[PDB]
Structure 1
Amino acid sequence: RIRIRLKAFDHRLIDQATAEIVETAKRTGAQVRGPIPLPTRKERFTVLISPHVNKDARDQYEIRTHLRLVDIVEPTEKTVDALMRLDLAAGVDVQISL
């Protein structure tokens, strides 16, 4: 039995991406819990601080990834077609768990 996940690099694009898989089924199945937020994680990243030739110093680069399980549970063949049409969308990533 399938489960599906959604990832995004912005706290707001993820909600208008949920609109293509959860609110496309608002009339086409049972109710779905308001999205559980999950941790955004630390996963610290770093870059060389000056545009050229400085190498003694390195800066922090603050970025986080959002992860949602969307509470939608097992999909119909129509919700799979709606999910595979979101796999064709740029700037986000969808994943399937078996």
Structure 2
Amino acid sequence: RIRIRLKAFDHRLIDQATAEIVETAKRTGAQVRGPIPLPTRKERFTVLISPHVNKDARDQYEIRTHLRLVDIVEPTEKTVDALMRLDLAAGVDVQISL
């Protein structure tokens, strides 16, 4: 019932983030349902590049988005205790919905 949502862009940096928070919870609480992912999220935007003319130069960029949900099974007073002010992933948005 306790949810740990993690919100970022790339799967190449969140992949060490789902490893650090299931194993450090295992040493203290050992009560988790496993990481259940979310569909990858795409924000594509075509933009004009020529400074004053020519509505043909549209280059596609995208700010990509990814979400992964940990969902520990039991409200443990040891998992949250050891992993309160602790998150390896840098430049990340953690959502510890208790």
How would you bin the TM-score normalised by the shorter chain? Answer: 0.5 to 0.7
Is residue 5–residue 94 contact of structure 1 (8 Å, CA) maintained in 2? yes
Q: CA deviation at 1:38?
A: 1.6
TM-score, normalization by structure 1: 0.64
Q: After TM superposition, which residue ranges in structure 1, 4 or more long, deviate above 6 angstroms?
A: 51-55
Q: CA deviation at 1:84?
A: 3.8
2-structure distance, mates of 1:80, 1:50? 52
- Rate the CA distance shift 1:77–1:53 in 2: closer, same or farther, 3 A: farther
- The structure having more radius of gyration, on CA atoms, is 2
- Rate the CA distance shift 1:53–1:65 in 2: closer, same or farther, 3 A: same
Any stretches of 5+ residues in structure 1 without a counterpart?
A: none
Identical amino acids, percent of aligned pairs: 100
2-structure distance, mates of 1:90, 1:50? 36
TM-score, normalization by structure 2: 0.64
1:56 aligned partner: 56
Q: CA deviation at 1:50?
A: 5.5
More helix by share: 2
Q: How many residues align?
A: 98
SS at match of 1:76: coil
RMSD, aligned CA = 3.4
1-structure distance, mates of 2:72, 2:53? 50
